[PDB]
Amino acid sequence: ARINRIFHERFPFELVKMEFDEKELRREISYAIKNIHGIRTGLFTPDMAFETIVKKQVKKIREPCLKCVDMVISELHIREREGRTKEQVMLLIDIELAYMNTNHEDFIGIRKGWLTINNIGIMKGGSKEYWFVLTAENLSWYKDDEEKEKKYMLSVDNLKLRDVEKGFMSSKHIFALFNTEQRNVYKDYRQLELACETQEEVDSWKASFLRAGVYPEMDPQLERQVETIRNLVDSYMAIVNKTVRDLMPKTIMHLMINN
């Protein structure tokens, strides 16, 4: 049975092969919102945009759960018991689809790093380094990784993202945050041309800014609704994986091995 225990701790590997294309998840969230409103208008995000995307991904779990039962039967009347152990695995998944419990270990119940300001004003020299935290809502500056100072901030929206021309440092690739409707870019430091340690870091920052909602150098509302639903789905599917990992061995131990 030290082989069986590997299954109970190899089954977690099958549950992470269930890959999906992100742009297909966003596509289905969008069509879900539109079909839920119907003829009406989108004042608030509907619940079924969350419930029906989650219910769709949970149904994918039936397969690996029934693989786990077959593997354990290989290691081990045992056939007649297989007819009863697999009902309780299907019936446990059905129960997961019957009700959506949002009261625990859920949101209801994005990028960090050091950035250097390349352009320095008349009152300062060298370069200015600060600890930067990016969220989907706002930008914040700090003097250290402890994130205690809370001195400068920028809005994710009403802001634009751009690359830079030739002449900027190549050893510390520089991007820029800027506005065109305002002269002062959220306590601007000479157009906020910020250097990173590597070019890959800049690209990752640009991706995070775009995800947050920074405009590159239905859509305004639908994209925010799609993003909100996507994050809520991920957090709730983390719960569903923990429950399945911890309930499969006990269902097999009770119904098959101990009998």
Coordinates of N, CA and C in Angstrom, one line a residue, residues 26-119:
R26 N -11.9 34.1 -21.6 CA -12.5 35.4 -21.7 C -13.6 35.5 -22.7
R27 N -13.5 34.7 -23.8 CA -14.5 34.7 -24.8 C -15.8 34.2 -24.2
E28 N -15.7 33.1 -23.4 CA -17.0 32.5 -22.9 C -17.6 33.4 -21.8
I29 N -16.7 34.1 -21.0 CA -17.3 35.0 -20.0 C -18.1 36.1 -20.7
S30 N -17.5 36.6 -21.8 CA -18.2 37.7 -22.5 C -19.6 37.3 -23.0
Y31 N -19.6 36.1 -23.7 CA -20.9 35.7 -24.3 C -21.8 35.3 -23.1
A32 N -21.3 34.9 -22.0 CA -22.2 34.6 -20.8 C -22.9 35.8 -20.3
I33 N -22.2 36.9 -20.2 CA -22.8 38.2 -19.7 C -23.8 38.7 -20.6
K34 N -23.5 38.7 -21.9 CA -24.5 39.2 -22.9 C -25.8 38.3 -22.9
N35 N -25.7 37.0 -22.8 CA -26.9 36.2 -22.8 C -27.6 36.2 -21.5
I36 N -27.0 36.6 -20.4 CA -27.7 36.7 -19.1 C -28.6 37.9 -19.0
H37 N -28.0 39.1 -19.4 CA -28.9 40.3 -19.5 C -30.1 40.0 -20.4
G38 N -29.8 39.6 -21.6 CA -30.9 39.3 -22.5 C -31.3 40.6 -23.3
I39 N -32.5 41.0 -23.2 CA -33.0 42.2 -23.8 C -32.6 43.4 -23.0
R40 N -32.3 43.3 -21.7 CA -32.1 44.4 -20.8 C -30.8 45.0 -21.0
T41 N -30.4 45.8 -20.0 CA -29.2 46.6 -20.1 C -28.3 46.3 -18.9
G42 N -27.0 46.4 -19.0 CA -26.0 45.9 -18.0 C -25.7 46.9 -17.0
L43 N -26.6 47.2 -16.0 CA -26.3 48.0 -14.9 C -25.2 47.4 -14.0
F44 N -25.4 46.2 -13.6 CA -24.5 45.5 -12.7 C -24.1 44.1 -13.3
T45 N -23.0 43.6 -12.8 CA -22.6 42.3 -13.3 C -23.5 41.2 -12.7
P46 N -24.0 40.3 -13.6 CA -24.9 39.3 -13.1 C -24.2 38.2 -12.3
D47 N -24.9 37.4 -11.5 CA -24.3 36.3 -10.8 C -24.0 35.1 -11.7
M48 N -24.9 34.8 -12.6 CA -24.8 33.7 -13.5 C -23.5 33.7 -14.4
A49 N -23.0 34.9 -14.6 CA -21.7 35.0 -15.2 C -20.6 34.4 -14.4
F50 N -20.8 34.3 -13.1 CA -19.8 33.6 -12.3 C -20.2 32.1 -12.1
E51 N -21.5 31.9 -11.8 CA -21.9 30.5 -11.5 C -21.8 29.6 -12.7
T52 N -22.1 30.0 -13.9 CA -22.1 29.2 -15.0 C -20.7 28.9 -15.6
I53 N -19.7 29.9 -15.4 CA -18.4 29.6 -15.8 C -17.7 28.6 -14.8
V54 N -18.0 28.8 -13.5 CA -17.5 27.8 -12.5 C -18.1 26.4 -12.8
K55 N -19.4 26.4 -13.0 CA -20.0 25.1 -13.2 C -19.5 24.4 -14.4
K56 N -19.0 25.1 -15.4 CA -18.5 24.5 -16.6 C -17.1 23.9 -16.3
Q57 N -16.3 24.6 -15.5 CA -14.9 24.0 -15.3 C -15.0 22.9 -14.3
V58 N -15.9 22.9 -13.3 CA -16.0 21.8 -12.3 C -16.3 20.5 -13.0
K59 N -17.1 20.6 -14.1 CA -17.5 19.3 -14.8 C -16.3 18.6 -15.4
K60 N -15.2 19.3 -15.6 CA -14.0 18.7 -16.1 C -13.3 17.8 -15.2
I61 N -13.8 17.8 -13.9 CA -13.1 17.0 -12.9 C -13.5 15.6 -12.9
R62 N -14.6 15.2 -13.5 CA -15.1 13.9 -13.5 C -14.1 12.9 -14.0
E63 N -13.3 13.3 -15.0 CA -12.4 12.3 -15.6 C -11.3 11.9 -14.7
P64 N -10.4 12.8 -14.3 CA -9.3 12.3 -13.4 C -9.7 11.6 -12.1
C65 N -10.9 12.0 -11.6 CA -11.4 11.3 -10.4 C -11.6 9.8 -10.6
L66 N -12.1 9.5 -11.8 CA -12.4 8.1 -12.2 C -11.1 7.4 -12.6
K67 N -10.1 8.1 -13.1 CA -8.8 7.5 -13.3 C -8.2 7.0 -12.0
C68 N -8.3 7.9 -10.9 CA -7.7 7.5 -9.6 C -8.3 6.2 -9.1
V69 N -9.7 6.1 -9.3 CA -10.3 4.8 -8.7 C -9.8 3.6 -9.5
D70 N -9.5 3.8 -10.8 CA -9.1 2.6 -11.6 C -7.6 2.2 -11.2
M71 N -6.8 3.2 -11.0 CA -5.4 2.9 -10.6 C -5.3 2.2 -9.2
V72 N -6.1 2.6 -8.3 CA -6.1 2.0 -7.0 C -6.6 0.5 -7.1
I73 N -7.6 0.3 -7.9 CA -8.1 -1.1 -8.1 C -7.0 -2.0 -8.7
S74 N -6.1 -1.4 -9.5 CA -5.0 -2.1 -10.1 C -4.1 -2.7 -9.0
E75 N -3.7 -1.8 -8.0 CA -2.8 -2.2 -7.0 C -3.5 -3.3 -6.1
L76 N -4.7 -3.2 -5.8 CA -5.4 -4.2 -4.9 C -5.4 -5.5 -5.6
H77 N -14.9 -9.6 -5.3 CA -15.4 -8.6 -4.4 C -14.9 -7.3 -4.7
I78 N -13.6 -7.1 -5.1 CA -13.0 -5.8 -5.4 C -13.7 -5.2 -6.6
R79 N -14.2 -6.1 -7.5 CA -14.9 -5.6 -8.7 C -16.3 -5.1 -8.3
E80 N -17.0 -5.9 -7.5 CA -18.3 -5.4 -7.1 C -18.2 -4.1 -6.3
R81 N -17.1 -3.9 -5.5 CA -17.0 -2.7 -4.8 C -16.7 -1.5 -5.7
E82 N -16.1 -1.8 -6.9 CA -15.9 -0.7 -7.8 C -17.2 -0.1 -8.3
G83 N -18.3 -0.9 -8.4 CA -19.6 -0.4 -8.7 C -20.2 0.6 -7.7
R84 N -19.7 0.6 -6.5 CA -20.2 1.4 -5.5 C -19.3 2.6 -5.1
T85 N -18.0 2.4 -5.3 CA -17.0 3.5 -5.0 C -17.2 4.6 -6.0
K86 N -17.6 4.3 -7.3 CA -17.6 5.3 -8.3 C -18.9 6.1 -8.3
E87 N -20.0 5.5 -7.8 CA -21.2 6.3 -7.6 C -20.9 7.5 -6.7
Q88 N -20.2 7.3 -5.5 CA -20.0 8.4 -4.6 C -19.0 9.4 -5.1
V89 N -18.2 9.0 -6.2 CA -17.3 10.0 -6.8 C -18.1 10.9 -7.7
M90 N -19.0 10.3 -8.5 CA -19.9 11.1 -9.3 C -20.9 11.9 -8.4
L91 N -21.4 11.3 -7.4 CA -22.4 12.0 -6.5 C -21.7 13.2 -5.8
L92 N -20.4 13.1 -5.5 CA -19.7 14.2 -4.9 C -19.5 15.4 -5.8
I93 N -19.3 15.1 -7.1 CA -19.2 16.2 -8.1 C -20.6 16.8 -8.3
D94 N -21.6 16.0 -8.5 CA -23.0 16.6 -8.6 C -23.3 17.5 -7.4
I95 N -22.9 17.2 -6.2 CA -23.1 18.0 -5.1 C -22.3 19.3 -5.2
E96 N -21.2 19.3 -5.8 CA -20.4 20.5 -6.0 C -21.1 21.5 -6.9
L97 N -22.0 21.0 -7.9 CA -22.7 21.8 -8.8 C -24.0 22.3 -8.3
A98 N -24.5 21.7 -7.2 CA -25.9 22.0 -6.7 C -26.0 23.4 -6.1
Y99 N -24.9 24.0 -5.6 CA -25.0 25.2 -4.8 C -23.6 25.9 -4.8
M100 N -23.6 27.2 -4.8 CA -22.3 28.0 -4.9 C -22.2 28.7 -3.5
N101 N -21.2 28.3 -2.8 CA -21.0 28.8 -1.4 C -19.8 29.7 -1.4
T102 N -20.1 31.0 -1.2 CA -19.1 32.1 -1.3 C -18.8 32.7 0.0
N103 N -19.0 32.0 1.1 CA -18.9 32.5 2.5 C -17.5 32.3 3.1
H104 N -16.6 31.6 2.4 CA -15.3 31.3 3.1 C -14.2 31.3 2.1
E105 N -13.0 31.7 2.7 CA -11.7 31.6 2.0 C -11.8 32.0 0.5
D106 N -12.6 33.0 0.3 CA -12.8 33.6 -1.1 C -12.5 35.0 -1.0
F107 N -12.4 35.7 -2.1 CA -12.3 37.1 -2.1 C -13.4 37.8 -1.3
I108 N -14.6 37.5 -1.6 CA -15.7 38.1 -0.9 C -15.8 37.7 0.5
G109 N -15.5 36.4 0.8 CA -15.6 36.0 2.2 C -14.3 36.3 3.0
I110 N -0.6 43.4 -8.4 CA -0.5 42.4 -9.5 C 0.9 42.3 -9.9
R111 N 1.7 43.3 -9.7 CA 3.1 43.3 -10.1 C 3.9 44.2 -9.1
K112 N 5.0 43.8 -8.7 CA 5.9 44.5 -7.8 C 7.3 44.5 -8.2
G113 N 8.1 45.5 -7.9 CA 9.5 45.6 -8.3 C 10.1 46.9 -8.0
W114 N 11.4 47.0 -8.2 CA 12.1 48.3 -8.1 C 12.1 49.0 -9.4
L115 N 11.8 50.3 -9.4 CA 11.8 51.1 -10.6 C 12.7 52.3 -10.4
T116 N 13.5 52.7 -11.4 CA 14.4 53.8 -11.3 C 13.9 54.9 -12.3
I117 N 13.9 56.2 -11.8 CA 13.5 57.3 -12.6 C 14.8 57.8 -13.3
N118 N 14.8 57.8 -14.6 CA 16.0 58.2 -15.4 C 16.1 59.7 -15.5
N119 N 15.0 60.4 -15.7 CA 15.1 61.9 -15.8 C 14.9 62.5 -14.4

